[model samples]
Target chain A: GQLGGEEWTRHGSFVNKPTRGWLHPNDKVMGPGVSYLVRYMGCVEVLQSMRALDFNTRTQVTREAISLVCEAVPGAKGATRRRKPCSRPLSSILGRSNLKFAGMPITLTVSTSSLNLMAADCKQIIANHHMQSISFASGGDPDTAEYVAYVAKDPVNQRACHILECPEGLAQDVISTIGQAFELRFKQYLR
Target chain B: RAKWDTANNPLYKEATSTFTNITYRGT
Candidate 1:
């Protein structure tokens, strides 16, 4: 699984990085990050999203906020459009996967929405481990944000979510701010 | 399982991601 030495192509001015900007390096102490499969690295695959707040909150209650958002208005509510579950075992809040980590400490962070989001838009992100999906088309007039996330065999293995650091100046993009909960497993730390 | 314990550790500072977001794709 060795790719090569210095990795001239993989490292650069950041502009020429991969489209997804994924950073996964082999480490003796850590496996791969966001881009490598975690055989069973906790529940839920890695999902990244812009934040809803201008700054990070030390105590961000995610489950409460997501539930509130889901009960809020459409176009903003996630589960509002989620249809009936797929009878598959990984589609519920209390699925066995979750129970496995009952006492684990989880931290929720808020971001400042994308550079393009309007001021009125809230900067928040909520990922349900039940495995969900969404549907969107560039030309669709309906412009409906349908549910599309769902559980599938890990694209490469029974695991998914190869994460990376919040690109500089993009800290607001994840984990509210550093130190809250960072999984510095690869090139992210070296950089 | 040996593999499962590694995944459950919170003190692990290994770089990773949080799959959190109520909505995305500009919806």
Candidate 2:
């Protein structure tokens, strides 16, 4: 029932545009619901709500949202070093080493071909009606922005599937599973 | 699906460690 690497795709619902909020660049808040998401992926800092950090805002996939999920899930961390328990601040995560992918300074990437093959096994996982909301903010810093994603208490978290990081060339079946998740998440807001 | 090796690598995204003006192309 939506356990393991099935989370990322299951967006309960994606709100159009972005829900607005304010953190008052001068003031940064911290908590469970209104978590202090690091990467300034948006234009505003203090937002009414926030979620998943973005790659641009991520120096490496350590403490960022992606890494956070790895820690949250049971086995996602795999043999790799347990950077820290989930919810670790972005500053500390960045302080550690981050894996580089495609010169993007990302922690990981799966082969698209391999992913496609694996995704097919989870078609139902992707088909499950889920929801997702993206919260973007204008960070206090004029140099960049902050973006976050919020989901209902229950949704598919795909961080478990390392295969997802891969493109759908070799992993067509598995990658399609991930793509289906992407389609379901963004289909509602198609322009 | 990346070809092994430094040069002719398919997945290599052109990235500059240092930020430089690209429109001018080092002019």
Candidate 3:
């Protein structure tokens, strides 16, 4: 399960190191932090995600957030978008997956609208868990400030993985978070 | 069942069984 150790590529001035000024004058592909959704320690699969805020709150509150995000716009005031569930049940939330952890489905949907009533619902759920969340410009650099939602799994086997209900951030983080969640389990079962 | 304590304590809550180190990913 091990690849050629100490990866050496031309993505940087130094072997395996991210590109620096001398080589390509582009920013580092990834930041210093390494958050792997799936890591193989010699064929043993591991999934990782940020831990939930509190245990006293509901267990599947993140799922609840998804459900609400698809339900009525929490406090729809003067919005034209129909406060209706998608005719196709799972279609309510944009990103849906057949992937399952311990039998429960995994969903990753984006709610970029700050004025979105759906975002409000997500905020309440996060608050219920005592998790403080804020919609921030991904880092400080995107053209337009865009925020998204990312969810992962790990219920039956707590060690499987876990996640924040609706993290508000760049779509890049969402991709990594969801990708890790998917790859880690997929690799484990494939073995 | 040998795995009697199926309701293992949530690691974040407290160290339930000490199976392995669960690192916090990111905020």
Candidate 4:
């Protein structure tokens, strides 16, 4: 069931929280049985491995994984500009796109709202989550750590919402950056 | 669920684009 607009709250038995499913930096092997997730929100990429991952490693792994999924896709060529029937990548269904740092699926949602409220919500989630710095996928340029979420407000409720996923440690960074970017481009953003 | 205008309006475009950021876990 969909929750208040765009947040996905369906953690299964595998997401043991506090430690089990958290992805760190520079993780060599997979974490137990967890599949590393590639959260491709818009053009930004964030990964969750239930273990750890670094920029160098993450970019490499994610690129390779996506390429693999792309390769696995049935039918060849970019000629059609559309996924063929029964040949779509397992993770391209809903479009949000997910892949393990190692393994499938996609889901997407969009919303628009006030910038002020979005900043507030971003602050709240940051405080509640104690987020820190995060890495952004920048053409494999490991030094560029600039990444952010694309925040929007709900016209109906006027509340703000962020539409991306990142590790809790860096959640605030992602939120605020997106908040800033959105703020800079707010007026021209939606309407 | 009530249906909202999905086009024309400026703000409508904000939420119009599909965004996929699926979180995966295996065990």
Candidate 5:
């Protein structure tokens, strides 16, 4: 039997906002929120074992883990587009066209070895294996603003954490999908 | 005894969902 579509692929937007203490080299002061397309690519098997750290109850460790990862890779910078100045009044009327604003696209994929966040442009792997726990959390309103939060680790085994703010409806689904991926990896290791 | 299989598991079936539209922000 074929696997379900929701587990394999998911299309979403990642809201890009400035984090405290971390300054990206390509950061631009985009008015309130700058969001970009983020896709959940399919998972694959890796050489490394899928055994991950158990879910920890303390927030201190989780908080430090996320902070390290964010500071290490951060998010991809938004692309800059050139704009030409208008020379004629009538030209503006005739040259009008529909416009849409979007930030740089990103891809999220997982494997037995690592969880990868990539730049969609050149498929550059940005963040890899910087994640530890697959968990959930809430923001603003506890019930309505829930999202997926993970305690992650860096290449040097540094503790870090990250939060993927998904829609309230699909937040749980995303978490479960990642959890299943890990379980499959663990099962493969046992074999 | 039954043999272990990854493909036959319910977890594999549930994990392999088709493409769906979602929006998320990371930090």
Candidate 6:
């Protein structure tokens, strides 16, 4: 699957996984064109690796926590090369409350291999395997009246379950797109 | 042999959706 316009190889490495020199796009560019190097893995390997982790503890979704989970996988050598350029970092973006909830604006990108969520500033919140199921429900409010919830298996930590509140019209489209992604992946798996 | 329209499949394309109010829950 594509990550920041770079395609990943079938064996779970990005086409140009490493970028040299300070002049690379990751260093000079702003927004989504900038790439991050992640040690990619297939669905089966990711799931199998994650199953060994402690599921009882609830860890907050921060950049450090996400990186730790990614590092837990067998071959993750180092963290992504992209520098944090945002004034409001990932730690500040994630809501830290139980009683009340805060909405963080994000773009959810779905592909055959993975589901990626990025903040408005283009910092990746989570990149997960797409094999898990997604469920839809109606929200209480009229403006944000639909909820799309899904389990993310790759970075299977406390933030494994994600609930996104959106407009009624956009909800079904998200579901269908994910469904199509699943179908495409399944067909490829069979072949 | 029957031909399949693999090139035009919407399933093969990447899908992006923008939204707010993201809540993360425990496993």
Best by DockQ: 3
DockQ of 6: 0.02
Q: Which stretches of candidate 3 lie over 4 Å from their true place?
A: A1-59, A74-173, A177-191, B1-27
Question: How many backbone clashes can be found in candidate 5?
Answer: 18
Cα lDDT tens digits, model 5, B1-27, are: 343221221111111111111111111
Model 5, residue A82: what's the lDDT?
22
Q: Pick the candidate with the highest lDDT.
A: 6
Query: On residues A82-166, what C-alpha lDDT tens digit does candidate 4 reach at each position?
Result: 2223432222211222222111111111111111111222222110110112222122112111222232222222211222232
User: Which candidate do you rate higher for TM-score, 1 or 6?
Assistant: 6
Which of the two, 3 or 5, has more TM-score? 5
Which parts of model 6 are misplaced by more than 4 Å? Answer: A1-101, A129-145, A154-159, A185-191, B1-27
lDDT tens digits, residues A1-191, model 1? 88766632321111221233432321211221212111111233312222321111101111212222222313232334332223321222112222121112222222122111011113221222121231110111111111111222233234222111112223232222211212331123221
TM per prediction: 0.18, 0.22, 0.21, 0.22, 0.32, 0.34
Q: Over the stretch A1-191, how does candidate 5's per-residue lDDT look in tens digits?
A: 97755453433333345553432211211211112234322111111111332122122222222222122222312213222223221112111211111233454444333455556767555455322432222122232223223333332223223333323433444344444444433433222
Residue A123 miss distance in model 4 (angstroms): 33
The lowest-lDDT stretch of 10 consecutive residues in candidate 3 chain A is A36-45
Looking at candidate 2 chain A, the ten consecutive residues that score lowest on lDDT are A26-35
lDDT of 2: 0.22
The clash tally of candidate 4 reads 13
Q: Residue by residue across A148-189, what tens digits does model 3's lDDT show?
A: 222222212222212222223423554443234233233332
> Model 1 - which docking category?
incorrect
Task: Give model 5's docking category.
Answer: incorrect
TM-score values for chain B across all models: 0.17, 0.16, 0.13, 0.16, 0.15, 0.16
Write the number of the candidate with greater TM-score, choosing between 1 and 3.
Answer: 3
User: Model 3, residue A156: displacement in angstroms?
Assistant: 29
